[PDB]
Design a protein around this ligand. Structure first.
Ligand code: HEM
Ligand SMILES: CC(C)CCC[C@@H](C)[C@H]1CC[C@H]2[C@@H]3CCC4=CC(=O)CC[C@@]4(C)[C@H]3CC[C@@]12C
Ligand code: NA
Ligand code: NA
Ligand code: NA
Ligand code: NA
Length: 396
């Protein structure tokens, strides 16, 4: 095994399909790894957990992304300022409020499958995996159903070109996407100030943190955080997890034969796909961390996918096993910033996967001998496309 020569900010690393071999080297030889440019990364399950449990030393207030300033959103804040924001919107994502959405989310799943069932084929990414979480979080945000496609396109342009090697033409698209989203959302904020609604934008507009109204800048960025959290994450577990079911037919047959295996299947899909490849922390002081000296002010990447394949926690991690138990993956992170939408994501995954294995029972990849492309982006990433085939059925 040769040491990886990699740039962890280069989107191409996360699409090369040699990332997990690079992770394996890190976990065995330098758990807190420094890449070709010296960027520090926590590669082992233990190192990620230890960093998450010490927010006083591993801060979010420097921003969660490499080479990027902190923004006015709660994921870029430390406690208690971060907690004050979480409490404004936590109520919409509790176990009961999520479960009470099952009928509406199930209806969206069937509407989306109704749109492709007569075709006998679709792009599983474009036509099922991406639109379902978009519709769910769009409804909570007050996005009109006919404008979901517009918001998802903005969202895609905001994350799919995150890379130290981004081209000028892709960078311009990211800039233009934020400008359009910013203009639209500021108009939305003014509309909800005149006529409040029950969507999350109106909730944030009507909120106070420590007795102060949220700034218009923060309102735009908190709304965007909720949007991207909803529509650029679950989609990759839906597509990538379904792909592993199709590529490991024993697992697909197991789930089709026993529906009570669905909760465990969802957890293994989450472990395998790890849509959030990394979150950054900024060191507030010099420290020695798992054999690596870290300096105050530098950033360290928490490699969630690397932790999800750590042999110290998972037996035979390269085997897709929907019956894996326990399955304490870190797809949702850990600590005070643990994913607020973890329950909503799991229900999105459960309802769509159950309806896919029900209404597309003979689902297959259009070419089982192919290798599907992954998005070369350094933050969230998954399958770009996924052509599938099935026997047509009639809509419901
Ligand atoms: C498979 C689906 C998802 C994955 C893998 C995922 C992953 C993550 C991760 C890794 C974090 C940071 C945790 C840390 O740094 O320790 C996070 C935070 C967050 N996620 Fe999720 N997420 C998913 C779905 C969602 C959904 C559906 C929403 C809906 C709004 C959402 C909203 C958020 C928010 C607001 C935060 C910031 C929480 C905070 O800073 O306290 N996520 N997510
Ligand atoms: C997956 C979720 C839990 C976290 C979501 C983080 C999103 C909202 C964050 C992460 C990366 C950020 C972008 C970083 C680069 C860029 C510089 C600009 O010129 C303005 C907009 C911005 C485009 C940011 C807008 C939204 C950002 C995308
Ligand atoms: Na790779
Ligand atoms: Na800043
Ligand atoms: Na654009
Ligand atoms: Na197949």
């Amino acid at each position: 095994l040769i040491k990886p020569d990699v740039d962890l900010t280069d989107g191409n690393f996360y699409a090369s399909r040699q990332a997990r071999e690079a992770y394996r080297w890190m976990r065995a030889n330098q758990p807190v790894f420094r890449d070709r440019n010296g960027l520090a990364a926590a590669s082992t399950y233990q190192a990620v957990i230890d960093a998450e449990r010490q927010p006083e030393l591993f801060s979010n207030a420097g921003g969660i992304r490499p080479d990027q300033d902190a923004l006015p959103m709660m994921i870029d804040m430390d406690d208690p300022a971060h907690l004050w924001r979480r409490k404004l919107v936590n109520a919409g994502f509790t176990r009961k409020r999520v479960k009470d959405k099952e009928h509406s989310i199930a209806q969206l799943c069937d509407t989306l499958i109704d749109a492709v069932c007569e075709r006998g084929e679709c792009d599983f990414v474009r036509d099922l995996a991406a639109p379902l979480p978009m519709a769910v979080i769009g409804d909570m945000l007050g996005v009109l159903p006919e404008q979901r496609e517009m918001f998802l396109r903005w969202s895609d342009d905001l994350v799919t070109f995150l890379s130290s090697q981004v081209s000028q033409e892709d960078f311009q698209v990211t800039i233009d996407a934020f400008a359009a989203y910013n203009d639209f959302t500021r108009a939305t904020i003014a509309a909800r100030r005149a006529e409040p609604t029950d969507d999350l934008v109106s909730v944030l507009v009507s909120s106070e943190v420590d007795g102060e109204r949220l700034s218009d800048d923060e309102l735009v960025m908190e709304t965007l955080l909720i949007l991207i959290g909803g529509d650029e994450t679950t989609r990759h577990t839906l597509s990538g997890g379904s792909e592993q079911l199709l590529r490991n037919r024993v697992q697909w047959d197991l789930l089709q034969s026993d529906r009570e295996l669905l909760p465990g299947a969802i957890e293994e899909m989450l472990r395998w796909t790890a849509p959030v490849k990394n979150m950054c922390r900024m060191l507030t002081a010099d420290t020695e961390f798992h054999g690596t000296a870290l300096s105050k002010g530098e950033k360290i990447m928490l490699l969630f996918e690397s932790a999800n394949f750590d042999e110290a926690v998972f037996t035979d991690p390269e085997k897709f096993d929907i019956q894996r138990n326990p399955n304490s993956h870190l797809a949702f992170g850990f600590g005070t910033h643990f994913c607020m939408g973890n329950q909503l994501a799991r229900l999105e995954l459960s309802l769509m996967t159950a309806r896919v294995v029900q209404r597309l029972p003979d689902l297959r990849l259009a070419d089982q001998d192919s290798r599907l492309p992954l998005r070369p982006a350094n933050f969230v990433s998954g399958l770009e496309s996924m052509p599938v085939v099935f026997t047509p059925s009639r809509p419901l």
